[PDB]
């Protein structure tokens, strides 16, 4: 019953195994076209390269507000997946975001792990849709939410970066309405893990990965953390992503975008 969850060479075991949300009920697979006239085969790194890559470790304090990442933006730093994504013009993938966050029996609190498809955040300056590339793709280091909306006033040097608000979730929706996304709740009373299988959701059959970002992960502490009686307490959160059933197409020369 203890999940010996093994994909590729790495292995995710557990101390508690409860559930595994498959988003929208569809397990990922390749392109299934029965009306396909060309039978030539694309470049698929699927023989041993479905591995669990591990992002940075963030520290969930008592007054921390949230974190957010993008996909496949977070995987461009490490792995051989980060190299295939640059040489190939277009490709698709599916993910298994696994978020572990351990605590003792005396801690409390509860995270909420979402997976928003097409996660468009909001800028800060009054210039509309005015956001640079390097500030809109922070990479595996992620970004953090805020309490109040503080727009920027520096006009000669505009910041050109996001300022999401946590209870607005950045987009503009409320947070209580944000459970229609495929989600999971890391309630530190009962469980300490959260795995979400993400299929390929996009309008096209296959689309570019340098410019477009399909899924967006957002971790919100729904209840604030509390240890026994102290006012300083920090537990770590670690995120783990595995690209399942990837395929690529159309080689070209390498592209290195600037990240200032």
């Amino acid at each position: 019953r203890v999940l010996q969850l093994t994909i590729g060479n790495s292995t995710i075991t557990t101390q508690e195994a409860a559930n595994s949300v498959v988003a929208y009920g569809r397990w990922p697979e390749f392109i299934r076209d029965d009306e396909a006239n060309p039978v030539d085969q694309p470049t698929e790194p699927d023989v041993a390269t479905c591995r669990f890559y591990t992002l940075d470790t963030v520290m969930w304090g008592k007054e921390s507000k949230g974190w957010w990442w993008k996909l496949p933006d977070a995987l461009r730093d490490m792995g051989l997946f980060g190299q295939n994504m640059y040489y190939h013009y277009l490709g698709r993938s599916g993910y298994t975001v696994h978020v572990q966050c351990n605590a003792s029996k005396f801690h409390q609190g509860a995270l909420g792990v979402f997976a928003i498809p097409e996660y468009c955040l909001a800028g800060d300056s009054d210039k509309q849709r005015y956001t640079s590339y390097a500030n809109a793709n922070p990479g595996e280091k992620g970004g953090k939410f805020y309490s109040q909306f503080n727009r920027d006033t520096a006009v000669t040097s505009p910041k050109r970066e996001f300022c999401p608000v946590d209870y607005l979730l950045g987009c503009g929706v409320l947070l209580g309405n944000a459970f229609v996304y495929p989600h999971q709740i890391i309630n530190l009373r009962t469980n300490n893990s959260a795995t979400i299988v993400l299929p390929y959701v996009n309008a096209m059959a296959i689309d570019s990965m340098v410019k477009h970002n399909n899924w967006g992960i957002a971790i919100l502490p729904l209840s604030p953390l509390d240890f026994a009686q102290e006012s300083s307490v920090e537990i770590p959160i670690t995120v783990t992503i595995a690209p399942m059933c990837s395929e690529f197409n159309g080689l070209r020369n390498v592209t290195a975008p600037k990240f200032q």
Binding site: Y87, Y89, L90, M204, A205, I206, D207, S208, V210, N249, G250, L251, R252, N253, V254, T255
Partner: protein, 116 residues
């Protein structure tokens, strides 16, 4: 290739899908789909640019979301020309469409102007 009979050489013609920089030198242009074309045996190549696109239909406007690609032609080897033979050759390039080309949504044109 419409040079003389004695002129030889090899030409590398290459195609590259969008997303990267346009290829400048031969070192980074041999990676994409390319055809090494000889000038000695025949005098004509045929390069079928495939259909690699995320969208089903591209547009007929100058757009950056649906960019076609790039075409470049480099010297594989230098042209070798004997003496008593003109050094300046010439080249003509054509274009066609295969039997799977298709269009839709008729509209106006911009290659005319009625000066009234």
């Amino acid at each position: 290739f419409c040079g003389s009979m004695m002129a030889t050489g090899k030409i590398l013609v290459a195609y590259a899908p969008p997303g990267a920089q346009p290829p400048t030198s031969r070192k980074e242009a041999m990676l994409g789909t390319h055809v090494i074309w000889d000038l000695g045996l025949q005098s004509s190549c045929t390069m079928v640019v495939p259909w690699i696109s995320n969208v089903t239909y591209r547009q007929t406007t100058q757009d950056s979301f649906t960019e076609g690609g790039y075409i470049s032609m480099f010297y594989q080897t230098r042209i070798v020309v004997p003496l008593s033979t003109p050094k300046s050759m010439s080249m003509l390039g054509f274009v066609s469409a295969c039997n799977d080309f298709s269009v839709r949504l008729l509209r106006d044109t911009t290659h005319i102007s009625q000066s009234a």
